[PDB]
Amino acid sequence: LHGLLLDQHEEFFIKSLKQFSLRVEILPSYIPVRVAEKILFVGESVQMFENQNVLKNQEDTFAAELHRLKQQPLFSLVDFEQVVDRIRSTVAEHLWKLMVEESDLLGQLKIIKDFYLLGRGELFQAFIDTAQHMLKTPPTAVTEHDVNVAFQQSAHKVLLDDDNLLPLLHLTIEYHGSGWAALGLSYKVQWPLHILFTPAVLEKYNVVFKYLLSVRRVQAELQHCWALQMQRQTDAIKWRLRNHMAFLVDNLQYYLQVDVLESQFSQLLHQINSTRDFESIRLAHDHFLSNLLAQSFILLKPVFHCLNEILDLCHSFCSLVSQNLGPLDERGAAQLSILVKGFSRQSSLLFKILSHQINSDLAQLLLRLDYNKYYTQ
Amino acid sequence: REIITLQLGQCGNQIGFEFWKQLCAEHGISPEGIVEEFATDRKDVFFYQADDEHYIPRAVLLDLEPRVIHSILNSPYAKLYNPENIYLGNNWASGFSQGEKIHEDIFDIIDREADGSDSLEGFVLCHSIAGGTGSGLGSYLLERLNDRYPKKLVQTYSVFPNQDEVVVQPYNSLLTLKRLTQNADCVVVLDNTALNRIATDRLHIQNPSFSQINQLVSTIMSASTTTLRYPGYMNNDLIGLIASLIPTPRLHFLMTGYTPLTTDKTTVLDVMRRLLQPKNVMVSTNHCYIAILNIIQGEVDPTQVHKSLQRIRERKLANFIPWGPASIQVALSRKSPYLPSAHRVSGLMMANHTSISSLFERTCRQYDKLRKREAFLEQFRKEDMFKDNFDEMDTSREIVQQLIDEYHAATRPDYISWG
Amino acid sequence: REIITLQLGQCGNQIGFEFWKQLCAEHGISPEGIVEEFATDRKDVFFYQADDEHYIPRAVLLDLEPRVIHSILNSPYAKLYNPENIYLGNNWASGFSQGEKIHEDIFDIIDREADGSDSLEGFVLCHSIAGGTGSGLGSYLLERLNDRYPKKLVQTYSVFPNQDEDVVVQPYNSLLTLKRLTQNADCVVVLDNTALNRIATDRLHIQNPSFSQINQLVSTIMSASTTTLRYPGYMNNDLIGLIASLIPTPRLHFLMTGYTPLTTDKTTVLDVMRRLLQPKNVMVSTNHCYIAILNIIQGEVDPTQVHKSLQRIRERKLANFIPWGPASIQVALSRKSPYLPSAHRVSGLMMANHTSISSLFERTCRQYDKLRKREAFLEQFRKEDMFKDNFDEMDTSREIVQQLIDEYHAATRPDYISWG
Amino acid sequence: YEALRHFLLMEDGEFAQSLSDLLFEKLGAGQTPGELLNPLVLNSVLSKALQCSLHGDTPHASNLSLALKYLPEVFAPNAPDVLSCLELRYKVDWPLNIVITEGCVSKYSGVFSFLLQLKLMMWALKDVCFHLKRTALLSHMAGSVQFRQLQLFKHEMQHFVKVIQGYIANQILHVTWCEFRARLATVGDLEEIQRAHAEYLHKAVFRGLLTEKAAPVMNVIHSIFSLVLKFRSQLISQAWGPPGGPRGAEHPNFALMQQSYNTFKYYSHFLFKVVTKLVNRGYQPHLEDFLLRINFNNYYQ
């Protein structure tokens, strides 16, 4: 009730999370970890409201209940577990409340959706378009600052001004030692939520943002490169059959995600709307990210190990058309033919892989039948 | 980035005008250009911001010697482009040839709509295919913009005749196809036997078949602008809509399908047999789909769109057979927070059916009937001026016959190279 | 250092009368001149004091001939703008010869009121360009001021000859006035009548009178563009604080003028500054471009907003640019001056050099050419016909203002540092 | 504090211009071997400026005194007092002197002396434009190229020092003060009041260019100021260039008036190259604000 680890020179089995960690070596066998985890959690709970008083007045009642259980000359494990689970409830009933009612966890997650999950399609479209080529080149020292002001510009250039979100939002590159390769998104948070969005969680969102952006930029650059021929020879068949044969792989890794993201996030929002318990909120978000980790295809290791590779095969197509409407049988049409067979062949190894049997992989499964090329070549 | 939205010619002004009308019950804007109180939609894509919340489509009026469309500038929704760009015959050469002196200031009016754009990617031209001055003048603004903005795309919205063969209707069609296949970027082409018999599956509107297909055409250009006007997490731009629909320079005319003809809930699985039907294709020999690219929007429920996608593939009762490797692509998108869409699950096919060429062949049957009777010919006193000896019509006929043959070669393995 | 103001002719009397009737609101003064408690001011910059708080502006009036110069007698306001000093023609030569024959008597009055100061700073004429009496009289008086007192920096409100197309001899009266001004003035605050009629499109349906209706706009514009002289604050206290970037030199002294938001007598400044650059507004009608611009922002305005605001205007790129050098927007920034009504809490106009004005002076010379090639409606009383006869007062006027056109166009290019 | 902002931070521009008019009229009269800096003339102009304020010598507007250290027995050309040893002080009462404080009034007189030499450059602005009015180009009939040139040379310099003036008038008088108007209303402790006043003043020195970290740019400001001082004094003491053609008359050094104006432009080119560096390396929004403004439309005009 008072956040005081009075355990000098000792262990009362509790060793910012350090000196706030459950030891279990020195823990009674007849006390479970199933309730020690509850103890530890309400202990960290008081630890983040006992400061910032420079949380309600029932401590005397709880002390009298604990003295009542102290006076029993027999150990009532179920009542001890019952009262500390009641105390854990009666803090969770307030931590939930401050996270929604006094911290707008919905609005924050909406921001995270809008940026880490590219939920602002118009904004990222204008960002990549206006900030393509200095991130296409390997980055210098000031280009992170330049894409930050181009990001600000992209956020205003859509003319749909939002709640002026920009102050928390900065685009940070691992510079020096390819700007699109080394770029990620940084974010900052307030003390009422600072615990939940511990960097361990945003580190993951950053990799997902990298994934999404990386495919999104190439899927984009391809489609503008297609227009370079469209300004009007037989080679314009091959260049643009090839365009389709590029289009299919990167649209397949991504037209899925447009569904898989919003769908997975529909589960999370209902689990936040479910119940008044921070443990449910916590495990709901843990369930949500650990789900989308699978949806990031990293667990489908072989196709993950061909992601940025086949993305670069699509770069090798996107670059090569950048120069003439005309006939390019000199080598263009020939090196193009490796990309005709390569994408369809890799997609055949992938089709065998799309046979976790999770609905997502079982949707990508769907997208190559009848036109059997991309599992038979 | 952002698109200019020109219109010209009697049909072109009309399908643009009635598209702005159809937006006024699908999208967020009143006839004054004022944003409405039924406005999750981005207007800047096509609509210039004049400061007092006047969303103006980057849109223009040209109509030298019309029949009925003089009344469109006084009809309500024609005002939705407020910036005063009313300016300057009805047959095809009467447009292209007088353009030789007429382009010089309407190019400046287009640059005033380009000043309405933050930085241009392309022009929607709602110019008349067949119907009026945009046949000629619009298909020549194509060239005058190609001369000066050559990387900026022109997508063409269209109408296309086949109603049992005024009866001069086909004569103004063919020259669009020749100039379009010579240089142009895209043509959403929509047919007057196909949408006639689809309209009678939902409405009484057969008396003025031609004038009444404009409503479906307007919904189809609303559809092919939804993911642009709304934050779709794919295909928020013309290049993203088109890029596999037009996998080659020749076959750059496109076709569409709405199965929710009961336009005005049932889980999204429920459309995923009816959507297969070739009877719901609005550009209705032997026909296949070159590739499958389709949409769902509006009432987007995630297990429903996921499992509906599974169930159309489980049935597959449609001719998905050639070399173009997409069995189906869809994803999902946001939509406006108030106004409806087609059965609200809104699903539309855009899979490129080669049947579109059977309508080019029907247009050829019409043009051969007129070419053999030579009766409705009129020779309007500026219509002599483009053809030295009625040669570009015939050049269009060999070009569109190749177009007909090539859509059918694309129905087979042989279209790897021209021959 | 202090103002002296001069309403003259009929139009000039009307717009001066309306200006001081607006300044009846902008400082609380009775029609007899005594204080009213309404409307941070210390009136010393414009008002002399008769010690029972009779607020006396340093102004000289005329009632003159019983043409609409006599409009002052039909008012209750006979001692507001008047220190009891009212001094006792359809064509410029009539108003010029009237000035020429009354010059010493009106000199006496301006000097007597000019002694009504600690020291002076500048004159302010309500001047009708191409008026009957007002051009000629005002443009004569400005020659006499350049002889007798060149030592104050004369400003002048200058309603300009484009009533959407009053007197048909106006083009001659204009180019006679321009021959004077281009060899006399420190500044000329020109306002298009075509564009003042239009200014009204963003507030009201009235845009026809081009006179009585224009007088309210001219009074609001004049009062606003002087409010910070009398409701002071940090900088731009003296008029030559604003005149020096409104007008760069007497070689380019025809000002572009912009009461561009019709609220600029709040939304956040990001929004007002688009409304402040409306090309359908502004009181000015082949590659036209700004030199320096000024916003005299006396507005309830926050520093965090204006940085974001200029940053957004820099990406709308509305202000046409790359002149010879000083192109930047002089946003002076201060609170909304404690009279200017709380309806829309931001105000300050957009006033500049812009070669749109150079086309208005080409149009003014071409309006003279619309007469000179025909000699239409010549009148030919010797009152007119005896002086304007070798045409030099128009031909050389065209030359000196054509050299102003070339210097304005050159000033809209970076090359104009060089001695070519 | 408002009264302190009125007088010491010059928001009563009529006091501050009366002070500037008297002080810099007496300084623009010459007196270059320090001969203006006598206690009695100095007090008379301070007193006279205070009488001409028009706000009045109210209880709030009491307690005003001059200052200097090592009063200069000599001045630089154009008489700038570029080592700014002209100063103002508010005499502090005991209960005021809990929150008023020695370092606070030191930094206050610092910004006062730095803005007061800016008001000397505004006074120079008057003087160089008065040189036009002074001979009035009294030969009314003869237009001049050295007129169209030189009276546009001064146009950029005045435009420049005035946009720097508007900029600094933002950086303190509301960029730093408008936040303090709510920050002082927020607090409820003496020490918080002292500390919030110290925030206001520290950020005023940090935003108003005067800080030791932005000083490399303040050196370019001195480089501009000194050039305009020492080359327009040479105009002040001369007439209007060589005769012949569209002509003025009666000064031979017109090519040096031109070349010094080229040296000014160079230092404004250098200014733009330099100021980017601080906002590319460090984080100073007021310097982005500056270089957003001073070369508003492009790289350089």
Q: Which chains touch B (3 or more CB pairs under 8 A)?
A: A, C
Which SS3 state, helix, strand or coil, does residue C12 take?
helix
Burial B224-252 (b: 16+ CB within 10 A, else e): bbbbbbbbbbbbbbbbbbbbbbbbbbbbb
User: Quick one: closest CA in C to B117, which residue?
Assistant: C316
In this structure, what token pair is assigned to residue C340?
A: 């200017």
Q: Which helix (H) or strand (E) holds C406?
A: helix C392-411
The upper half-sphere exposure of residue D38, i.e. CA atoms within 13 Å in the direction of its Cβ, equals 9
Q: How far does the CA of residue A171 sit from the closest CA of chain C (Å)?
A: 20
CB C134 within 8 A of CB C177: no
Contact partners, residue B374, CB within 8 Å, separation at least 6: none
Annotation: binding site of C for GTP: 130-136
CA distance linking residue C249 with residue C121, whole number of Å? 18
In this structure, what token pair is assigned to residue B355?
A: 């049947």
Q: How far is CA A88 from the centre of its chain?
A: 30
CA distance linking residue A120 with residue A155, whole number of Å? 9
CA distance linking residue D14 with residue D50, whole number of Å? 10
Question: CA C384 → CA B40, C131, C173, distances in Å?
Answer: 70, 14, 10
CB B8 within 8 A of CB B113: no
What single-letter amino acid sits at B367? Answer: Y
Site from A130, A149, A151, A156 to mutate, C interface, most C CB atoms within 10 angstroms: A156
Backbone angles phi, psi at A312, to 5 degrees: -75, -30
CA distance linking residue C42 with residue C228, whole number of Å? 11
What single-letter amino acid sits at B360? Answer: F
User: Quick one: closest CA in D to A148, which residue?
Assistant: D280
Q: Which chains touch C (3 or more CB pairs under 8 A)?
A: A, B, D
List of long-range contacts for D218-224, beta carbons under 8 Å, 24+ apart: D220/D267, D220/D270, D220/D271, D220/D274, D221/D164, D222/D82, D223/D267, D224/D160, D224/D264, D224/D267, D224/D268, D224/D271
Give D 251-270 residues with CB within 8 A of chain C: 265
* Class of residue C244 by CB neighbours under 10 A (exposed 0-12, middle 13-18, buried 19+): buried
* Class of residue C252 by CB neighbours under 10 A (exposed 0-12, middle 13-18, buried 19+): buried
CA distance linking residue B225 with residue B2, whole number of Å? 12
Supply the DSSP symbol for D118. H
Of D125, D148, D166, the CB nearest to C330: D166
Asked whether residue B232 is marked as a ligand-binding residue, the answer is no
CA distance linking residue B54 with residue B247, whole number of Å? 38
Burial D11-24 (b: 16+ CB within 10 A, else e): bbbbbbbbbbbbbb
Supply the DSSP symbol for D73. S
Q: How far does the CA of residue B122 sit from the closest CA of chain C (Å)?
A: 20
Q: What angle do CA A301, A305, A307 make, to 5 degrees?
A: 110
Question: CA C87 → CA A42, C35, C106, C136, D174, distances in Å?
Answer: 92, 25, 7, 17, 48
User: Quick one: closest CA in C to B83, which residue?
Assistant: C280
CB < 8 Å to B231, chain A: 120-122
In this structure, what token pair is assigned to residue C394?
A: 């128009």
CB count, 10 Å around CB of A351?
18
CB A187 within 8 A of CB A204: no
Q: How far does the CA of residue C213 sit from the closest CA of chain B (Å)?
A: 24
In this structure, what token pair is assigned to residue B184?
A: 């142009």
Backbone angles phi, psi at B22, to 5 degrees: -65, -35
Q: CA nearest B300: which of B254, B325, B331?
A: B331
List of long-range contacts for B407-412, beta carbons under 8 Å, 24+ apart: B407/B251, B407/B354, B407/B356, B407/B357, B407/B360, B408/B285, B408/B286, B408/B354, B408/B357, B410/B251, B410/B290, B410/B322, B410/B354, B411/B286, B411/B287, B411/B288, B411/B322, B411/B354, B412/B322
User: Quick one: closest CA in D to A146, which residue?
Assistant: D280
CA distance linking residue B324 with residue A368, whole number of Å? 10
CB C301 within 8 A of CB C333: yes
C317: left (phi over 0), alpha (psi -120 to 50) or beta: left
C317 interfaces chain A, CB cutoff of 8 Å: no
Which SS3 state, helix, strand or coil, does residue B94 take?
helix
Q: CA nearest B298: which of B335, B337, B254?
A: B335
Q: CB A121 to CB B237 under 8 A?
A: no
Q: How far does the CA of residue B44 sit from the closest CA of chain C (Å)?
A: 14
Q: What is the dihedral angle through the alpha carbons of A65, A70, A76, A78, rounded to the nearest 10 degrees? A: 40
Q: CA nearest D88: which of D57, D43, D120?
A: D43
Q: Give the number of A-B residue pairs with CB atoms closer than 8 Å.
A: 159
Backbone angles phi, psi at B56, to 5 degrees: -105, 120
Q: What angle do CA A180, A146, B113 make, to 5 degrees?
A: 95
Terminal-residue alpha carbon distance, chain B: 38
Q: SS3 helix, strand, coil % of chain A, rounded to 5? A: 65, 5, 30
Q: CA nearest B113: which of B63, B64, B56, B62?
A: B56
Backbone angles phi, psi at C370, to 5 degrees: -60, -25
CA distance linking residue A195 with residue D13, whole number of Å? 52
CA distance linking residue C415 with residue A331, whole number of Å? 49
Terminal-residue alpha carbon distance, chain D: 41
What single-letter amino acid sits at A353? Answer: I
Which SS3 state, helix, strand or coil, does residue A359 take?
coil
Site from C229, C234, C335, C418 to mutate, D interface, most D CB atoms within 10 angstroms: C234
CB < 8 Å to C322, chain D: 297-298, 301
Give D 9-48 residues with CB within 8 A of chain C: 10-14, 16-17
Q: CB A122 to CB B118 under 8 A?
A: no
Which value, in Å, is the radius of gyration of the alpha carbons in chain C? 21
Question: CA A225 → CA A246, A319, A345, B44, B322, distances in Å?
Answer: 12, 8, 24, 24, 25
Q: CB B153 to CB A234 under 8 A?
A: no
Sign of CA dihedral B82, B87, B90, B96: negative
Q: How far does the CA of residue B49 sit from the closest CA of chain A (Å)?
A: 9
CB < 8 Å to B316, chain A: 369-370
Residue corresponding to tokens 């999750």: B40
Site from B47, B248, B332, B402 to mutate, A interface, most A CB atoms within 10 angstroms: B248
Backbone angles phi, psi at C331, to 5 degrees: -65, 100
Q: Which helix (H) or strand (E) holds B182?
A: helix B174-183
CB C127 within 8 A of CB C11: no
Residue corresponding to tokens 């306002």: C191
CA distance linking residue B173 with residue B169, whole number of Å? 7
Query: What is the residue-wise DSSP string for B216-263?
Result: HHHHHHHHHHHHHHTTBSS--SHHHHHTTTS-SSTT-EE--EE---S-
Q: CA nearest D131: which of D255, D17, D242, D237?
A: D237
Q: How far does the CA of residue A226 sit from the closest CA of chain C (Å)?
A: 29
CA distance linking residue D95 with residue A306, whole number of Å? 75
Q: CA nearest A221: which of A140, A304, A120, A322?
A: A322
Crossing angle (nearest 10°) for helices C92-114 and C170-181? 40
CB C331 within 8 A of CB D166: yes
What single-letter amino acid sits at D151? Answer: Q
CB A132 within 8 A of CB A315: no
CB B272 within 8 A of CB B312: yes
Q: CB D292 to CB C310 under 8 A?
A: yes
Q: CA nearest B185: which of B161, B150, B217?
A: B150
CA distance linking residue C63 with residue C75, whole number of Å? 12
Please list the residues that pair with C352 across neighbouring strands: C256, C293
Q: How far does the CA of residue C248 sit from the closest CA of chain D (Å)?
A: 6
Q: How far is CA D260 from the centre of its chain?
A: 21
CA distance linking residue D173 with residue D6, whole number of Å? 10
In this structure, what token pair is assigned to residue D69?
A: 């250290």
Which SS3 state, helix, strand or coil, does residue A51 take?
coil
Asked whether residue B135 is marked as a ligand-binding residue, the answer is yes
CA distance linking residue D208 with residue D244, whole number of Å? 48
Q: How far is CA B38 from the centre of its chain?
A: 26
CB < 8 Å to A119, chain B: 233
Question: CA C385 → CA B221, C40, C101, C161, distances in Å?
Answer: 70, 54, 18, 22
CA distance linking residue D53 with residue A98, whole number of Å? 56
Query: What is the residue-wise DSSP string for C133-149?
Result: SHHHHHHHHHHHHHHH-
Terminal-residue alpha carbon distance, chain A: 67
User: Quick one: closest CA in D to A140, which residue?
Assistant: D280
In this structure, what token pair is assigned to residue C386?
A: 């005896």
C147 interfaces chain A, CB cutoff of 8 Å: no
Helix and strand tally (H, E) in chain B?
Answer: 11, 12
CB < 8 Å to C275, chain B: 51
CB C265 within 8 A of CB C340: yes
Which SS3 state, helix, strand or coil, does residue D183 take?
helix
The upper half-sphere exposure of residue C21, i.e. CA atoms within 13 Å in the direction of its Cβ, equals 17
CB D265 within 8 A of CB C283: no
* Class of residue D82 by CB neighbours under 10 A (exposed 0-12, middle 13-18, buried 19+): middle
Q: Which helix (H) or strand (E) holds C294?
A: strand C290-298
Supply the DSSP symbol for C34. B
CA distance linking residue A168 with residue A189, whole number of Å? 8
* Class of residue D74 by CB neighbours under 10 A (exposed 0-12, middle 13-18, buried 19+): exposed
CA distance linking residue C90 with residue A209, whole number of Å? 77
CA distance linking residue C170 with residue B218, whole number of Å? 56
Question: CA B147 → CA A208, A229, B140, distances in Å?
Answer: 44, 16, 11
In this structure, what token pair is assigned to residue D135?
A: 């001979």
Q: CA nearest D152: which of D163, D160, D140, D141?
A: D160
* Class of residue D281 by CB neighbours under 10 A (exposed 0-12, middle 13-18, buried 19+): exposed
Q: What length is written for chain B?
A: 419
Supply the DSSP symbol for A368. G
Which SS3 state, helix, strand or coil, does residue C125 take?
strand
CA distance linking residue D91 with residue D96, whole number of Å? 10
Which SS3 state, helix, strand or coil, does residue A171 take?
strand
